[PDB]
Design a protein around this ligand. Structure first.
Ligand SMILES: Nc1ncnc2c1ncn2[C@@H]1O[C@H](COP(=O)(O)OP(=O)(O)NP(=O)(O)O)[C@@H](O)[C@H]1O
Ligand SMILES: Nc1ncnc2c1ncn2[C@@H]1O[C@H](COP(=O)(O)OP(=O)(O)NP(=O)(O)O)[C@@H](O)[C@H]1O
Ligand SMILES: [Mg+2]
Ligand SMILES: [Mg+2]
Lengths: 569, 381, 202
DNA sequence: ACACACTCTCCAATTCTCTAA
DNA sequence: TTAGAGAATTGGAGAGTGTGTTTTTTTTTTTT
């Protein structure tokens, strides 16, 4: 009956006030926040008692129950009244697990009853619903009662229930072996862990791998009973922004996507898309769109696809899509039959999952127009209306669209106007904020530096790799860039009278010039949407400075950008 | 029906040819099903033994290995030595790279053959499918977009939607042979533009969104618009659009020729090939297959500095010439010269270096790489 | 919808009304409910729940009125009067079946990006009973009513004793054109629940 | 948890037989 | 001659056991 000594070990481990008192402090915090689970770091346990630590990982169940009882006794010794508020306490684990860190592919039947640490990408969820643990019945005519664990009438207030949910984890597709589809596993979430993860999240789950029963065919289904769930995704920024020696926005734009050479204005516009504008609301109930949309058109081999694959790696909550490989149902939402409950419910599509994020559409000119009808409502209003599976609803799909396409006839024709080369409808072309045209002008002076840069890139080898190796199948630093952009997304700067005056006067001047100009010399007409674009771009530039005001410099930069985009051949 | 247990799990995948040893047993009123309990598995076709490594090291060491390999490729087909050399480079491939800012470069090589009927195009495809460690052969006329890349369909059990892999997924890491290439529909050739360059397939259907891998080579065969090449009509023999012609590393034009000496030689070669079917009773196909797999997994080259300098200076001349030809002409050409061609020559230089297990490519290798590209794409342009 | 956290689908709850609380609530109406939350009786340990309701709580003159329409927009003086008379309406004459209807109907043709959106939305906001839709046939419910698994919805239906506004009319389909034609003639529509020829006010 | 089909048991109703009113 | 008590055979009232149970992607012909 050594488990009574094992519980005794855990209780004297938890009583660490004699040695710097970290865990007693954590338990005190748990009490103050009215909580009922604790998170223990396995490194500390391994340091204090090697035998107990190395036994815990290979006997998850029999050891964790002893640990839970030790915690219950310790909190009761601190405060019995608090200990009586909850039926039982729980403990979760963190740290380094060594050999027990696995994936949904490498996890096999020999891991049963070990503590395991699985990681992958979440693909689906069931709905939260209650489960019974103890039921009670009472008789008022006799003052009598009975109980059961898992005449008289049921006592819902003396009975007690707890929450239950199921989710599914999938292997990272980048790590799949050659020529095979990804594998997956089912995770069970219970009590205070429900709804801590949603589809598209990258998670790392700690739990115990276990069979479920099922005459018998001698065959079982295996599930991971979760024990903890984890997610993954100042002075430096202060002194850097305080310098004011140079236009910081130009330096950040120059440093964007170092592999790709040229295309200055495109990089500046993409940085404005990453920073975004700001929303505003009016007393009549109307509101102004804060997010930005961008379109790219051009010849073969001008790095259009690579810029999309870069933004997708350097922005939070970003999604890919290709014109030929996707459907309107897949873009918005699809009805699904739940196998846990049997019920019919909706499942999110690509543009819904990109809410408060970015969505990249490659090969945009190959979509059927019926899909573009779905994209129209999303890009204009940020909402999507659905009328299926007994639900009439207005879902949230607020996102910035970055899209790329190739011109009609494959190679752009100099002897035709922009509206002739571009294959899209004039209604749709009016929705994007900025439209860029890119061309492979075969100048030898430019080919010299381009070819040199490409060849420099192909001779590199990483410092952690040796002279002849080959990989298996399966300027500002990037880290600072991410942190600076992340802080800059809070500032919410405001207009100034001078910037407003400048924008108004300059817009009137631009309108007069456009009135003089002809469709043979412009991509699209200029209207109030131009003012909205100018305001968004000036706001974003002020945001990059972290200046609380929108200044004349921001407005001047914004108008120069749109001037280049609209009034160059 | 087969049952598999303990150490035999995940030893095979579908499409493989295998030999099985097991127990045979049972699982209208009188019907019962039956199946086999497996006790041993042998893949009719493993880690290389030390002896095998010594032989592969010897093959890599000996000095004229390039010609030896060239003669092993499709040995029955008369002539076409340059075409066989290009096929060798396709099988070995360049090298994959991941750059410091996280972007990728594809490494592997795409090849196209276009021209006259009766010139053994289909035979070469039929050989390369057997010579490669991983390979698949399909017809352009008999295939669909959802069949080439990937598909979505409802599970025959349960009620859920499930994913399925097409030809370009099954051949991940190997070669895909597309025969009758000029007889696909336009909207179906559009479907492989992501797979041929970015080597991944992006799907968004039925409430599921994922990205799949396809790291494979494309080898294709086609005719002129007019059935055989008509030199009086020039560029009109080709009607593929520029956005796909630019995704091939090399393009070959094959024309039939009526020289008497070659005809007599070829006739004798054909007749003795037929006659020697009974009488029959340099590297073999099996040996070459294992050698290719070994070289691909162990060796990854890079350019020497001077080799990159030489290639740079050549590329400027090449771009200038192409620009002047289009400027002089009243018409724009179908086969462009772009940065993709600069990368193409580098991939061939790495392949040539890989055959000899050498860590660096050299000016000799760049010279041969430029020669191969000079013949094919500049004859086509 | 505004209470839903980012990137999620909204949820629903069943409410049982009994006794003198019946007939208070209506479809599409905001309410606050007091009740008891309980599990459903069977006939597994996981069970559905509902809310037992105890209380339900719902959440000259011509020139002056013409000048009051869309003052944000410069000019368009008589267009505003036309919209005023659209809201006021004429008279159904009804001489023994030889009917002349009083409802005004008008159409606006706009150049690309012109100010009509502001005027349209002003009339939409102003009118005491009205609805809006767009001709592209979006993923939601259509101009006419629809069926789910009872009948529901439809912009032509939800505006009844009022005015309905159609946007980007030129992108309509033949189904939409025939529906508008039928409304213009008979001011009623038909949708088949399950092959039965049900019909509905418009 | 709630309905058919089947098997089986023990209690006491119906008749034989002997006896008294 | 008419009627009641003691012994033997048989029906059926009752219990126990075993078992069953609209909503999305892809192809093919012919209408445009
Ligand atoms: N300025 C450049 N810097 C770096 N790489 C470049 C540059 N220009 C072209 N490339 C190369 O161009 C190749 C193809 O890039 P890609 O993004 O597909 O071009 P694209 O404009 O999208 N052409 P396409 O996809 O056929 O329409 C890549 O392998 C790049 O290495
Ligand atoms: N050099 C050669 N050596 C041997 N057989 C040859 C040669 N050239 C052609 N053939 C024969 O040509 C016939 C057709 O072969 P095939 O591979 O279809 O050529 P192809 O170029 O693909 N013809 P096509 O499909 O009409 O374009 C076969 O019977 C081959 O044996
Ligand atoms: Mg591209
Ligand atoms: Mg052939």
């Amino acid at each position: 009956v050594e488990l009574r000594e094992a519980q005794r070990d855990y209780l004297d481990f938890l009583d660490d006030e004699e040695d710097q008192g970290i865990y007693q402090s954590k338990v005190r915090e748990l009490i103050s926040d009215n909580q009922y689970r604790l998170i223990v770091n396995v490194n500390d346990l391994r340091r204090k008692n090697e035998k107990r630590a190395n036994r815990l990982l290979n006997n998850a169940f029999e050891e964790l129950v002893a640990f839970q009882r030790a915690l219950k006794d310790f909190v009761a010794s601190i405060d019995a009244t608090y200990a009586k508020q909850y039926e039982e306490f729980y403990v979760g684990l963190e740290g380094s697990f060594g050999s027990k860190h696995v994936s949904p592919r490498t996890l096999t039947s020999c891991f049963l009853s070990c503590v395991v640490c699985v990681e992958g990408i979440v693909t689906k969820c069931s709905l939260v619903r209650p489960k019974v643990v103890r039921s009670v019945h009472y008789c008022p005519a006799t003052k009598k009662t009975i109980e059961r664990r898992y005449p008289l009438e049921t006592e819902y207030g003396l009975s007690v229930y707890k929450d239950h949910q199921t989710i599914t984890i999938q292997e990272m597709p980048e790590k799949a072996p050659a020529g095979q589809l990804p594998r997956s596993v089912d995770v069970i979430l219970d009590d205070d862990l429900v709804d801590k993860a949603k589809p598209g999240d990258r998670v790392q789950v700690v739990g115990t791998y276990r069979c479920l029963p099922g005459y018998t065919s001698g065959t079982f289904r295996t599930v991971l009973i979760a024990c903890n769930v984890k997610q993954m995704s100042i002075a430096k920024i202060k002194k850097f922004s305080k310098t004011r020696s140079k236009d910081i926005f130009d330096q950040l734009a120059k440093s964007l996507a170092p592999s790709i050479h040229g295309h200055d204005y495109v990089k500046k516009a993409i940085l404005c898309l990453l920073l975004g504008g700001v929303e505003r609301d009016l007393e009549n109930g109307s509101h102004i769109r804060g997010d930005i949309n961008i379109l790219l058109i051009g010849d073969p081999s001008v790095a259009k696809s690579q810029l999309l694959r870069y933004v997708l790696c350097t922005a939070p909550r970003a999604i890919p899509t290709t014109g030929r490989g996707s459907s309107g149902v897949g873009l918005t939402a699809a009805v699904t039959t739940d196998q846990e409950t049997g019920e019919r419910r909706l499942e999110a599509g690509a543009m819904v999952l990109a809410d408060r994020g970015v969505v990249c559409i490659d090969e945009f000119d190959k979509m059927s127009d019926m899909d573009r009808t779905a994209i129209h409502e999303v890009m204009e209003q940020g909402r999507v209306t659905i009328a299926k599976a007994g639900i009439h609803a207005r879902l949230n799909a607020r996102c910035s669209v970055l899209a790329a396409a190739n011109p009609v006839y494959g190679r752009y024709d100099q002897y035709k106007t922009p509206m002739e080369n571009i294959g899209l409808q004039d209604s749709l072309l009016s929705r994007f904020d900025l439209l860029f045209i890119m061309l492979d002008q075969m100048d030898p002076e430019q080919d010299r530096e381009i070819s040199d840069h490409v060849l420099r890139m192909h001779r590199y080898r990483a410092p952690g790799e040796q002279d002849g190796d080959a990989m298996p199948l399966g300027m500002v630093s990037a880290a600072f860039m991410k942190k600076y952009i992340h802080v800059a997304k809070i500032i919410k700067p405001v207009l100034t009278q001078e910037s407003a005056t400048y924008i108004a006067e300059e817009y009137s001047r631009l309108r007069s010039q456009d009135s003089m100009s002809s469709d043979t010399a412009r991509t699209s007409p200029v209207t109030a949407r131009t003012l909205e674009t100018l305001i968004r771009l000036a706001t974003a530039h002020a945001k990059a400075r972290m200046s609380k005001t929108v200044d004349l410099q921001d407005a001047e930069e914004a108008v120069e950008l749109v001037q280049y985009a609209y009034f160059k051949k | 029906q087969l049952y598999c247990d303990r150490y035999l799990c995940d030893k095979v995948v579908p499409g493989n040819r295998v030999t099985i040893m097991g127990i045979y047993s049972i699982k209208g009123v009188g019907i019962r099903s039956s199946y086999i309990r497996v006790l041993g598995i042998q893949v009719d076709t493993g880690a290389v033994s030390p002896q095998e490594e010594e032989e592969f090291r010897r093959l890599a060491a000996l000095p004229n290995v390039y010609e030896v390999i060239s003669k092993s490729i499709a040995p029955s087909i008369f002539g076409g030595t340059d075409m066989k050399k290009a096929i060798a480079c396709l099988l070995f491939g360049g090298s994959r790279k991941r750059l410091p800012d996280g972007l990728t470069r594809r490494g592997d090589i795409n090849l196209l053959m276009l021209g006259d009927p009766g010139t053994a195009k289909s035979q070469l495809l039929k050989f390369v499918e057997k010579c490669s460690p991983i390979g698949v052969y399909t017809s352009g006329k008999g295939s669909s977009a959802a069949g080439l890349t990937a598909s979505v369909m409802r599970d025959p059990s349960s009620r859920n939607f499930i994913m399925e892999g097409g030809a370009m997924v099954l051949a991940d890491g190997g070669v895909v042979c597309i025969d009758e290439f000029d007889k696909m529909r336009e909207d179906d050739r559009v479907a492989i533009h992501e797979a041929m360059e970015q080597q991944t397939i992006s799907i968004a259907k039925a409430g599921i969104t994922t990205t799949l891998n396809s790291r494979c080579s494309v080898l294709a065969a086609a005719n002129s618009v007019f059935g055989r090449w008509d030199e009086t009509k020039g560029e009109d023999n080709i009607d593929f659009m520029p956005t796909i012609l630019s995704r091939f590393d090399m393009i070959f034009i094959v024309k039939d020729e009526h020289n008497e000496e070659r005809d007599v030689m070829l006739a004798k070669h054909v007749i003795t090939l037929h006659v020697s079917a009974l009488t029959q009773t340099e590297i073999d196909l099996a040996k070459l297959k294992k050698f290719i797999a070994y070289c691909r997994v162990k060796c990854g080259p890079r350019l020497s500095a001077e080799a990159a300098e030489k290639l740079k200076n050549r590329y400027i001349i090449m771009r200038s010439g192409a620009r002047q030809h289009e400027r002089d002409s009243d018409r724009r050409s179908s086969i462009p010269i772009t940065v993709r061609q600069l990368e193409a020559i580098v991939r061939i230089a790495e392949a040539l270096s890989k055959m000899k297990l050498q860590p660096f490519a050299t000016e000799a290798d760049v010279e041969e790489a430029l020669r191969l590209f000079q013949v094919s794409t500049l004859d086509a342009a | 919808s505004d209470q839903v956290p980012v990137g999620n689908i909204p949820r629903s709850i069943t409410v049982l009304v009994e006794g003198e609380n019946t007939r208070i609530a209506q479809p599409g109406d905001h309410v606050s409910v007091t009740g008891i939350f309980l599990p459903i009786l069977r006939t597994g340990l996981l069970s559905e729940t509902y809310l037992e309701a105890h209380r339900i709580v719902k959440m000259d003159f011509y020139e002056k009125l013409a000048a009051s329409i869309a003052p944000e927009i410069y000019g368009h003086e008589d267009v505003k009067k036309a919209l005023l008379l659209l809201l006021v309406g004429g008279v159904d004459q009804s001489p023994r079946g030889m009917k002349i209807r009083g409802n005004i109907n008008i159409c606006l043709m706009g150049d690309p990006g012109v100010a009509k959106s502001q005027l349209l939305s002003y009339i939409d906001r102003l009118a005491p009973r009205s609805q809006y839709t767009t001709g592209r046939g979006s993923s939601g419910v259509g101009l006419t009513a629809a069926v789910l698994r009872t009948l529901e919805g439809g912009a032509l239906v939800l505006a009844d004793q009022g005015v309905c506004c159609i946007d980007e009319f030129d992108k309509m389909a033949e189904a939409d054109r025939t529906a508008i034609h039928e409304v213009m003639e008979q001011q009623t529509i038909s949708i088949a629940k399950a092959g039965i020829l049900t019909t509905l006010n418009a």
